[PDB]
Amino acid sequence: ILGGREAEAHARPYMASVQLNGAHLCGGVLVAEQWVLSAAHCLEDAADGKVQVLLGAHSLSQPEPSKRLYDVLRAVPHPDSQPDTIDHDLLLLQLSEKATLGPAVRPLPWQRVDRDVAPGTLCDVAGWGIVNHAGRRPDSLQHVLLPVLDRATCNRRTHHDGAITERLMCAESNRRDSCKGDAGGPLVCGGVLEGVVTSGSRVCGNRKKPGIYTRVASYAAWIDSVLA
């Protein structure tokens, strides 16, 4: 997260760190007791590496009573995801067992009604991604509040030039933004999950290249099918 601040510890009990061989890789969001939603291109990461999900965390490295690292029973990328597109960029991770819930670990309600978030709505995104241009990785969860950007502005040639489908949404990226390591994390508006950070290549913190988020409401039936 660029231009953000350290998050209040455990105030986002839905937040997940998706890990590969014990290192933070991507964000994710607990959407059911046994299921974490993240981004498909994260799993281009990779092969038969050990994918795990850390719940209940603030610090990646330090002991905390609520921290628990879960193994992953099954990883389910969206079937229409492709290496060279930002479309359908969702991944569902089935934990080894249902997560132990408490004040620091709880699924987030997610949007089922397929209607766009209003322009200007202030939403929250959080992550353990890089915090400066050098690539410094934070030990603790960061977040930033970002206003939703209307799709037509986002689709201008100066911006993302037609790439923002009805299944995608944008937020402003003026110095404050998600960046490398934040893919798959949650964009939360009014206490409800609305978006998942996409995991394609994108400059960070340039107002001319808004953040792009997959609209979870667009994929409600798919999420239900996988969890069935």
PDB file of all heavy atoms in Angstrom, residues 137-158:
ATOM      1  N   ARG A 137       8.966  -3.740   2.139  1.00  0.00           N
ATOM      2  CA  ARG A 137       7.834  -4.546   2.559  1.00  0.00           C
ATOM      3  C   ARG A 137       7.575  -4.306   4.051  1.00  0.00           C
ATOM      4  O   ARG A 137       8.479  -4.432   4.870  1.00  0.00           O
ATOM      5  CB  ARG A 137       8.146  -6.029   2.340  1.00  0.00           C
ATOM      6  CG  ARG A 137       8.422  -6.419   0.887  1.00  0.00           C
ATOM      7  CD  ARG A 137       7.193  -6.977   0.186  1.00  0.00           C
ATOM      8  NE  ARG A 137       7.461  -7.233  -1.233  1.00  0.00           N
ATOM      9  CZ  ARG A 137       6.745  -8.018  -2.038  1.00  0.00           C
ATOM     10  NH1 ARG A 137       5.662  -8.669  -1.584  1.00  0.00           N
ATOM     11  NH2 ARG A 137       7.123  -8.151  -3.312  1.00  0.00           N
ATOM     12  N   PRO A 138       6.345  -3.966   4.429  1.00  0.00           N
ATOM     13  CA  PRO A 138       6.037  -3.741   5.835  1.00  0.00           C
ATOM     14  C   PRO A 138       5.850  -5.043   6.606  1.00  0.00           C
ATOM     15  O   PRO A 138       5.313  -6.007   6.062  1.00  0.00           O
ATOM     16  CB  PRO A 138       4.726  -2.963   5.774  1.00  0.00           C
ATOM     17  CG  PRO A 138       4.056  -3.486   4.546  1.00  0.00           C
ATOM     18  CD  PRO A 138       5.170  -3.780   3.574  1.00  0.00           C
ATOM     19  N   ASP A 139       6.235  -5.053   7.874  1.00  0.00           N
ATOM     20  CA  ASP A 139       5.943  -6.202   8.703  1.00  0.00           C
ATOM     21  C   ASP A 139       4.459  -6.258   9.077  1.00  0.00           C
ATOM     22  O   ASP A 139       3.912  -7.333   9.302  1.00  0.00           O
ATOM     23  CB  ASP A 139       6.796  -6.161   9.959  1.00  0.00           C
ATOM     24  CG  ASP A 139       6.473  -7.295  10.906  1.00  0.00           C
ATOM     25  OD1 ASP A 139       6.787  -8.457  10.565  1.00  0.00           O
ATOM     26  OD2 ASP A 139       5.882  -7.028  11.973  1.00  0.00           O
ATOM     27  N   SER A 140       3.803  -5.102   9.171  1.00  0.00           N
ATOM     28  CA  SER A 140       2.426  -5.068   9.610  1.00  0.00           C
ATOM     29  C   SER A 140       1.470  -4.538   8.565  1.00  0.00           C
ATOM     30  O   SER A 140       1.862  -3.851   7.622  1.00  0.00           O
ATOM     31  CB  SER A 140       2.275  -4.310  10.901  1.00  0.00           C
ATOM     32  OG  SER A 140       2.588  -3.007  10.668  1.00  0.00           O
ATOM     33  N   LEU A 141       0.201  -4.869   8.756  1.00  0.00           N
ATOM     34  CA  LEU A 141      -0.842  -4.557   7.801  1.00  0.00           C
ATOM     35  C   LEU A 141      -0.984  -3.042   7.658  1.00  0.00           C
ATOM     36  O   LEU A 141      -1.024  -2.328   8.659  1.00  0.00           O
ATOM     37  CB  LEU A 141      -2.153  -5.138   8.298  1.00  0.00           C
ATOM     38  CG  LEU A 141      -3.336  -5.016   7.341  1.00  0.00           C
ATOM     39  CD1 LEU A 141      -3.137  -5.824   6.089  1.00  0.00           C
ATOM     40  CD2 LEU A 141      -4.611  -5.421   8.054  1.00  0.00           C
ATOM     41  N   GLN A 142      -1.068  -2.576   6.414  1.00  0.00           N
ATOM     42  CA  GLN A 142      -1.297  -1.182   6.082  1.00  0.00           C
ATOM     43  C   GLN A 142      -2.672  -1.041   5.438  1.00  0.00           C
ATOM     44  O   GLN A 142      -3.237  -2.017   4.944  1.00  0.00           O
ATOM     45  CB  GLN A 142      -0.232  -0.695   5.112  1.00  0.00           C
ATOM     46  CG  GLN A 142       1.200  -0.995   5.528  1.00  0.00           C
ATOM     47  CD  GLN A 142       1.633  -0.213   6.752  1.00  0.00           C
ATOM     48  OE1 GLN A 142       1.622   1.018   6.738  1.00  0.00           O
ATOM     49  NE2 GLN A 142       2.053  -0.910   7.787  1.00  0.00           N
ATOM     50  N   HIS A 143      -3.207   0.177   5.401  1.00  0.00           N
ATOM     51  CA  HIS A 143      -4.434   0.395   4.656  1.00  0.00           C
ATOM     52  C   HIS A 143      -4.489   1.811   4.124  1.00  0.00           C
ATOM     53  O   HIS A 143      -3.737   2.695   4.537  1.00  0.00           O
ATOM     54  CB  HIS A 143      -5.658   0.142   5.526  1.00  0.00           C
ATOM     55  CG  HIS A 143      -5.988   1.285   6.411  1.00  0.00           C
ATOM     56  ND1 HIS A 143      -7.118   2.059   6.231  1.00  0.00           N
ATOM     57  CD2 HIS A 143      -5.306   1.833   7.440  1.00  0.00           C
ATOM     58  CE1 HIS A 143      -7.122   3.023   7.136  1.00  0.00           C
ATOM     59  NE2 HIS A 143      -6.039   2.907   7.882  1.00  0.00           N
ATOM     60  N   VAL A 144      -5.432   2.022   3.217  1.00  0.00           N
ATOM     61  CA  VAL A 144      -5.707   3.348   2.688  1.00  0.00           C
ATOM     62  C   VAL A 144      -7.184   3.424   2.325  1.00  0.00           C
ATOM     63  O   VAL A 144      -7.790   2.431   1.917  1.00  0.00           O
ATOM     64  CB  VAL A 144      -4.779   3.658   1.492  1.00  0.00           C
ATOM     65  CG1 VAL A 144      -5.033   2.734   0.291  1.00  0.00           C
ATOM     66  CG2 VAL A 144      -4.826   5.134   1.141  1.00  0.00           C
ATOM     67  N   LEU A 145      -7.749   4.612   2.487  1.00  0.00           N
ATOM     68  CA  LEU A 145      -9.101   4.913   2.055  1.00  0.00           C
ATOM     69  C   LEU A 145      -9.051   5.562   0.694  1.00  0.00           C
ATOM     70  O   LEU A 145      -8.299   6.511   0.492  1.00  0.00           O
ATOM     71  CB  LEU A 145      -9.792   5.840   3.040  1.00  0.00           C
ATOM     72  CG  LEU A 145      -9.889   5.315   4.457  1.00  0.00           C
ATOM     73  CD1 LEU A 145     -10.353   6.401   5.422  1.00  0.00           C
ATOM     74  CD2 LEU A 145     -10.831   4.122   4.485  1.00  0.00           C
ATOM     75  N   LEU A 146      -9.827   5.038  -0.248  1.00  0.00           N
ATOM     76  CA  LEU A 146      -9.816   5.467  -1.641  1.00  0.00           C
ATOM     77  C   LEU A 146     -11.246   5.688  -2.126  1.00  0.00           C
ATOM     78  O   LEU A 146     -12.122   4.886  -1.844  1.00  0.00           O
ATOM     79  CB  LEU A 146      -9.168   4.382  -2.526  1.00  0.00           C
ATOM     80  CG  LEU A 146      -7.746   3.926  -2.185  1.00  0.00           C
ATOM     81  CD1 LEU A 146      -7.368   2.722  -3.046  1.00  0.00           C
ATOM     82  CD2 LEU A 146      -6.734   5.051  -2.373  1.00  0.00           C
ATOM     83  N   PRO A 147     -11.468   6.749  -2.903  1.00  0.00           N
ATOM     84  CA  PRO A 147     -12.766   6.976  -3.517  1.00  0.00           C
ATOM     85  C   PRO A 147     -12.925   6.214  -4.828  1.00  0.00           C
ATOM     86  O   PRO A 147     -12.002   6.141  -5.635  1.00  0.00           O
ATOM     87  CB  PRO A 147     -12.770   8.478  -3.786  1.00  0.00           C
ATOM     88  CG  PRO A 147     -11.334   8.781  -4.056  1.00  0.00           C
ATOM     89  CD  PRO A 147     -10.536   7.864  -3.170  1.00  0.00           C
ATOM     90  N   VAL A 148     -14.096   5.632  -5.021  1.00  0.00           N
ATOM     91  CA  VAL A 148     -14.430   4.970  -6.262  1.00  0.00           C
ATOM     92  C   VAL A 148     -14.433   5.991  -7.411  1.00  0.00           C
ATOM     93  O   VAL A 148     -14.913   7.117  -7.264  1.00  0.00           O
ATOM     94  CB  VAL A 148     -15.794   4.267  -6.129  1.00  0.00           C
ATOM     95  CG1 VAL A 148     -16.312   3.764  -7.474  1.00  0.00           C
ATOM     96  CG2 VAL A 148     -15.714   3.138  -5.115  1.00  0.00           C
ATOM     97  N   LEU A 149     -13.907   5.570  -8.564  1.00  0.00           N
ATOM     98  CA  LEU A 149     -13.841   6.379  -9.776  1.00  0.00           C
ATOM     99  C   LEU A 149     -14.834   5.789 -10.786  1.00  0.00           C
ATOM    100  O   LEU A 149     -14.871   4.584 -11.018  1.00  0.00           O
ATOM    101  CB  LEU A 149     -12.431   6.354 -10.348  1.00  0.00           C
ATOM    102  CG  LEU A 149     -12.201   7.151 -11.628  1.00  0.00           C
ATOM    103  CD1 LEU A 149     -12.426   8.641 -11.385  1.00  0.00           C
ATOM    104  CD2 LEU A 149     -10.823   6.863 -12.215  1.00  0.00           C
ATOM    105  N   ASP A 150     -15.634   6.649 -11.412  1.00  0.00           N
ATOM    106  CA  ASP A 150     -16.619   6.180 -12.378  1.00  0.00           C
ATOM    107  C   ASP A 150     -15.946   5.458 -13.554  1.00  0.00           C
ATOM    108  O   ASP A 150     -14.836   5.795 -13.982  1.00  0.00           O
ATOM    109  CB  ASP A 150     -17.495   7.338 -12.862  1.00  0.00           C
ATOM    110  CG  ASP A 150     -16.780   8.233 -13.832  1.00  0.00           C
ATOM    111  OD1 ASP A 150     -16.832   7.943 -15.046  1.00  0.00           O
ATOM    112  OD2 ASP A 150     -16.137   9.216 -13.392  1.00  0.00           O
ATOM    113  N   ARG A 151     -16.652   4.464 -14.078  1.00  0.00           N
ATOM    114  CA  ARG A 151     -16.075   3.583 -15.077  1.00  0.00           C
ATOM    115  C   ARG A 151     -15.728   4.319 -16.374  1.00  0.00           C
ATOM    116  O   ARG A 151     -14.708   4.025 -16.983  1.00  0.00           O
ATOM    117  CB  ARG A 151     -17.012   2.394 -15.344  1.00  0.00           C
ATOM    118  CG  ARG A 151     -16.406   1.357 -16.265  1.00  0.00           C
ATOM    119  CD  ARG A 151     -17.260   0.100 -16.450  1.00  0.00           C
ATOM    120  NE  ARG A 151     -17.417  -0.625 -15.191  1.00  0.00           N
ATOM    121  CZ  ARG A 151     -18.472  -0.580 -14.387  1.00  0.00           C
ATOM    122  NH1 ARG A 151     -19.543   0.137 -14.694  1.00  0.00           N
ATOM    123  NH2 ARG A 151     -18.439  -1.247 -13.241  1.00  0.00           N
ATOM    124  N   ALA A 152     -16.547   5.275 -16.796  1.00  0.00           N
ATOM    125  CA  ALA A 152     -16.266   5.988 -18.035  1.00  0.00           C
ATOM    126  C   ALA A 152     -14.959   6.783 -17.944  1.00  0.00           C
ATOM    127  O   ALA A 152     -14.149   6.759 -18.873  1.00  0.00           O
ATOM    128  CB  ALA A 152     -17.418   6.893 -18.423  1.00  0.00           C
ATOM    129  N   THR A 153     -14.714   7.467 -16.827  1.00  0.00           N
ATOM    130  CA  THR A 153     -13.450   8.177 -16.649  1.00  0.00           C
ATOM    131  C   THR A 153     -12.309   7.178 -16.674  1.00  0.00           C
ATOM    132  O   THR A 153     -11.302   7.394 -17.339  1.00  0.00           O
ATOM    133  CB  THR A 153     -13.428   8.980 -15.336  1.00  0.00           C
ATOM    134  OG1 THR A 153     -14.517   9.915 -15.332  1.00  0.00           O
ATOM    135  CG2 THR A 153     -12.107   9.719 -15.148  1.00  0.00           C
ATOM    136  N   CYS A 154     -12.480   6.068 -15.963  1.00  0.00           N
ATOM    137  CA  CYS A 154     -11.432   5.057 -15.901  1.00  0.00           C
ATOM    138  C   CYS A 154     -11.089   4.474 -17.268  1.00  0.00           C
ATOM    139  O   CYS A 154      -9.947   4.053 -17.495  1.00  0.00           O
ATOM    140  CB  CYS A 154     -11.849   3.945 -14.951  1.00  0.00           C
ATOM    141  SG  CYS A 154     -10.487   3.054 -14.252  1.00  0.00           S
ATOM    142  N   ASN A 155     -12.073   4.453 -18.168  1.00  0.00           N
ATOM    143  CA  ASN A 155     -11.921   3.886 -19.512  1.00  0.00           C
ATOM    144  C   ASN A 155     -11.374   4.860 -20.536  1.00  0.00           C
ATOM    145  O   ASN A 155     -11.150   4.465 -21.680  1.00  0.00           O
ATOM    146  CB  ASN A 155     -13.238   3.299 -20.023  1.00  0.00           C
ATOM    147  CG  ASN A 155     -13.361   1.827 -19.699  1.00  0.00           C
ATOM    148  OD1 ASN A 155     -12.364   1.101 -19.711  1.00  0.00           O
ATOM    149  ND2 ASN A 155     -14.565   1.375 -19.409  1.00  0.00           N
ATOM    150  N   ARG A 156     -11.163   6.115 -20.159  1.00  0.00           N
ATOM    151  CA  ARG A 156     -10.572   7.070 -21.098  1.00  0.00           C
ATOM    152  C   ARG A 156      -9.231   6.580 -21.605  1.00  0.00           C
ATOM    153  O   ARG A 156      -8.500   5.859 -20.924  1.00  0.00           O
ATOM    154  CB  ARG A 156     -10.411   8.430 -20.444  1.00  0.00           C
ATOM    155  CG  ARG A 156     -11.707   9.116 -20.148  1.00  0.00           C
ATOM    156  CD  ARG A 156     -11.503  10.394 -19.398  1.00  0.00           C
ATOM    157  NE  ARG A 156     -12.733  11.176 -19.389  1.00  0.00           N
ATOM    158  CZ  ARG A 156     -12.787  12.501 -19.236  1.00  0.00           C
ATOM    159  NH1 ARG A 156     -11.680  13.200 -19.033  1.00  0.00           N
ATOM    160  NH2 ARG A 156     -13.954  13.123 -19.272  1.00  0.00           N
ATOM    161  N   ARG A 157      -8.888   7.019 -22.813  1.00  0.00           N
ATOM    162  CA  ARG A 157      -7.610   6.654 -23.417  1.00  0.00           C
ATOM    163  C   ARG A 157      -6.422   7.039 -22.533  1.00  0.00           C
ATOM    164  O   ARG A 157      -5.448   6.303 -22.471  1.00  0.00           O
ATOM    165  CB  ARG A 157      -7.483   7.290 -24.810  1.00  0.00           C
ATOM    166  CG  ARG A 157      -6.149   7.015 -25.520  1.00  0.00           C
ATOM    167  CD  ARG A 157      -6.253   7.191 -27.043  1.00  0.00           C
ATOM    168  NE  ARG A 157      -4.991   6.938 -27.753  1.00  0.00           N
ATOM    169  CZ  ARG A 157      -4.456   5.736 -27.993  1.00  0.00           C
ATOM    170  NH1 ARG A 157      -5.041   4.611 -27.573  1.00  0.00           N
ATOM    171  NH2 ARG A 157      -3.303   5.658 -28.656  1.00  0.00           N
ATOM    172  N   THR A 158      -6.510   8.193 -21.873  1.00  0.00           N
ATOM    173  CA  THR A 158      -5.492   8.664 -20.932  1.00  0.00           C
ATOM    174  C   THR A 158      -5.324   7.738 -19.717  1.00  0.00           C
ATOM    175  O   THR A 158      -4.275   7.715 -19.085  1.00  0.00           O
ATOM    176  CB  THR A 158      -5.837  10.073 -20.399  1.00  0.00           C
ATOM    177  OG1 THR A 158      -7.179  10.104 -19.906  1.00  0.00           O
ATOM    178  CG2 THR A 158      -5.714  11.118 -21.511  1.00  0.00           C
TER     179      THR A 158
END
